[PDB]
């Protein structure tokens, strides 16, 4: 590929018009023009955030990461970028497992990639950066031989929209958790502990 | 139902009341007992107003008075694209009251807006107030006053928080450059010249 990157990779290091390519052979950034592997905008993802309660099942993979915590879910409703960043990553890569964690009164998200080969399209990165601007760090690392994108919130700025929290909590409480989703969290128990600590 | 003192900061809002301003006085009324809200239909939320903010370049004619308030400043227009609450608040007020004239100005990259009501009788529905407070929260003050015998809502920005969306500024600026300014809009600004200069000290 075109150029090695150092891990952990903070997305503030993103070179315009490049994709990230992670494989067992190395960690690289490549020209989007030259990329053989190569989506919604941050605005689209904000509309989806606004419309969450109309799309609970559609966004079920997101809500599993809360592990039925009403407290975490409430925090998410004050922080659109958590949902926005998941939504963007999910569009480019379905084989992901997000886990949410609160620290210092703020919600943070770790997105665990199931497969060892991971391509992050340029168009995904640029939209994540829009969603993350100022108040979040977004970093890619390999942790326990898994690619993980960590979304850490430094400050929670006022959101100028309100979600119906009660409706959202009720729908999340009612969701079934499939066996394979519970199993994946158990698989990743040591990984999740490392990320959170 | 009850007299209010001006200036009225919207953080003083009594739950489930409307504001009614007329030559006879400045009052807050129970939303249940309000006859103006009997007639009207369900107004947009702060969420609807954010979707409108996102979709601005598709709705230029509808929101034309918003853009006239920039008085042709590309700098002020650009700032508005980093501060959704300015547009949101205008959108919310416009839904409840079409006869308004917004005027914008900036300090140190923080955009402010004053909304001048054309008519001396002004009704601010409860539902409008609550959505404005959602849009404003933390970073803006929203105040109602009578200034030079005009009802004016002032939206003052204390801090600009990060916005997690980006508008196509270039497209918006080109659409704004292309708008014609009707004679009566230019005339209204000249009518309000002294009012605008009074409000601009904030
Ligand atoms: Zn690519
Ligand atoms: Zn009313």
Sort out which chain A residues have CB atoms less than 8 A from B164's CB and list them: 42, 46, 80-81, 84, 130-133
Among all residues of chain A, which has the CA nearest to that of B134?
Answer: A160
Question: Is the Cβ–Cβ distance between A28 and A4 less than 8 Å?
Answer: yes
Question: Is the Cβ–Cβ distance between B74 and B80 less than 8 Å?
Answer: no
Q: How was this structure determined?
A: X-ray
The label of the residue with tokens 């990779």 reads A9
* Nearest bound ligand to the CA of residue A31: 1
**A100 - beta bridge partners?**
A109
Are A161 and B47 an interchain contact pair (Cβ–Cβ within 8 Å)? Answer: yes
Sort out which chain B residues have CB atoms less than 8 A from A157's CB and list them: 138-139, 161-162
Chain breaks in chain B (C to N over 2.5 A) after: none
The CATH fold assigned to A40-196 is: Heat Shock Protein 90 (3.30.565)
List, as one string, the DSSP characters of B109-122: TEEEEEEEESSS-E
Nearest to B50 among A131, A132, A160 (CB): A160
List, as one string, the DSSP characters of A26-85: EEEEEETTT-S-----HHHHHHHHHTGGG-TTTTHHHHHTTTT-HHHHHHHHT-HHHHHH
Helix or strand holding residue B107 (H, E): strand B100-107
Distance in angstroms (rounded) separating the CA atoms of residues A136 and A128: 10
Helix or strand holding residue A120 (H, E): strand A118-120
Nearest to B54 among A47, A130, A159 (CB): A47
Rg (CA), chain A: 16
* Nearest bound ligand to the CA of residue A92: 1
Are A81 and B164 an interchain contact pair (Cβ–Cβ within 8 Å)? Answer: yes
Distance in angstroms (rounded) separating the CA atoms of residues A33 and A15: 13
Nearest to B134 among A46, A50, A161 (CB): A161
Question: Is the Cβ–Cβ distance between B117 and B150 less than 8 Å?
Answer: yes
What is the nearest CA distance from A125 to chain B, expressed in angstroms? 14
Are A42 and B166 an interchain contact pair (Cβ–Cβ within 8 Å)? Answer: yes
Treating both helix axes as pointing N-terminal to C-terminal, what angle do A122-132 and A42-50 enclose, rounded to 10 degrees?
60
Which residues fall within 8 angstroms of residue B71, CB to CB, at 6 or more apart?
B103, B104, B189
With b meaning 16 or more CB within 10 Å and e meaning fewer, what string describes B22-51?
eeeebebbebeebeebeeeeebbbbbbbbb
Treating both helix axes as pointing N-terminal to C-terminal, what angle do B74-82 and B169-178 enclose, rounded to 10 degrees?
140
Q: Classify burial at B94, counting beta carbons within 10 Å of its beta carbon; exposed 0-12, middle 13-18, buried 19 or more.
A: buried
Distance in angstroms (rounded) separating the CA atoms of residues A7 and A178: 33
Nearest to A102 by CA among A78, A82, A80, A75: A75
Q: Classify burial at A169, counting beta carbons within 10 Å of its beta carbon; exposed 0-12, middle 13-18, buried 19 or more.
A: middle
Are A131 and B164 an interchain contact pair (Cβ–Cβ within 8 Å)? Answer: yes
* Lookup: tokens for A171: 């729908």
Alpha helices in chain B (DSSP H): 36-39, 46-54, 64-68, 74-82, 84-96, 126-136, 169-178, 183-191, 193-199
Distance in angstroms (rounded) separating the CA atoms of residues B56 and A135: 25
* Lookup: tokens for B111: 């955009």
Chain A residues near any Cβ of chain B (below 8 Å): 41-43, 46-47, 50, 80-81, 84, 130-135, 157-163
Distance in angstroms (rounded) separating the CA atoms of residues A98 and A67: 10
* Resolution (Å units): 1.9
Question: Is the Cβ–Cβ distance between A118 and A111 less than 8 Å?
Answer: no
Chain breaks in chain A (C to N over 2.5 A) after: 38
* Lookup: tokens for B112: 């402010």
Taking the centre of ligand 2 as the mean of its atom positions, its distance from the CA of residue B146, in whole angstroms, is 19
Chains A and B form CB pairs within 8 A to the count of: 62
Are A160 and B54 an interchain contact pair (Cβ–Cβ within 8 Å)? Answer: no
Nearest to A47 among B51, B139, B163 (CB): B51
Sort out which chain B residues have CB atoms less than 8 A from A158's CB and list them: 137-139, 161
What is the nearest CA distance from A159 to chain B, expressed in angstroms? 8
DSSP-derived 3-state class of residue B145: strand
Helix or strand holding residue A127 (H, E): helix A122-132
What string of H, E and C letters represents the secondary structure of B147-164? ECCEEEEEEEECCCCCCC
Question: Is the Cβ–Cβ distance between B145 and B152 less than 8 Å?
Answer: yes
Taking the centre of ligand 2 as the mean of its atom positions, its distance from the CA of residue B37, in whole angstroms, is 4
Test mutation, B45, B159, B164, chain A, max A CBs within 10 A: B164
Are B166 and A130 an interchain contact pair (Cβ–Cβ within 8 Å)? Answer: yes
Which residues fall within 8 angstroms of residue A109, CB to CB, at 6 or more apart?
A65, A82, A85, A86, A98, A99, A100, A101, A150, A151
* Nearest bound ligand to the CA of residue B28: 2
Which residues fall within 8 angstroms of residue B122, CB to CB, at 6 or more apart?
B19, B20, B21, B22, B97, B151
* Lookup: tokens for A89: 């990553």
What is the nearest CA distance from B136 to chain A, expressed in angstroms? 7
* Nearest bound ligand to the CA of residue B31: 2
CB atoms within 10 A of CB B71: 13
Domain boundaries, chain A: 40-196
**A101 - beta bridge partners?**
A108
């Amino acid at each position: 590929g075109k150029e090695s990157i150092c891990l952990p990779f903070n997305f503030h290091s993103h070179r315009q018009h490049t994709c990230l390519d992670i494989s067992p052979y190395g960690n690289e950034q490549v020209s989007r023009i030259a990329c053989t592997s190569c989506l919604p905008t941050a605005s689209d993802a904000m509309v989806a955030f606004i419309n969450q309660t109309s799309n609970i099942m559609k966004n079920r993979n997101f809500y599993y990461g809360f592990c039925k915590s009403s407290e975490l879910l409430k925090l998410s409703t004050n922080q659109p970028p958590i949902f926005q960043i998941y939504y963007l990553l999910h569009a480019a890569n379905h084989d992901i497992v997000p886990f949410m964690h609160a620290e210092d009164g703020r919600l943070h998200m770790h997105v665990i990639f199931e497969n060892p080969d991971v391509h992050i399209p340029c168009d995904c990165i640029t939209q994540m950066l829009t969603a993350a601007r100022e108040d979040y760090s977004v970093t890619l690392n390999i942790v326990r031989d898994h690619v993980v994108i960590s979304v850490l919130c430094h400050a929670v700025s006022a959101s100028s929209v309100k979600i119906d929290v009660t409706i959202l909590q009720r729908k999340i409480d009612e969701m079934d958790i499939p066996n394979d989703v519970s199993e994946s969290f158990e698989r990743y128990k040591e990984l999740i502990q490392e990320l959170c600590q």
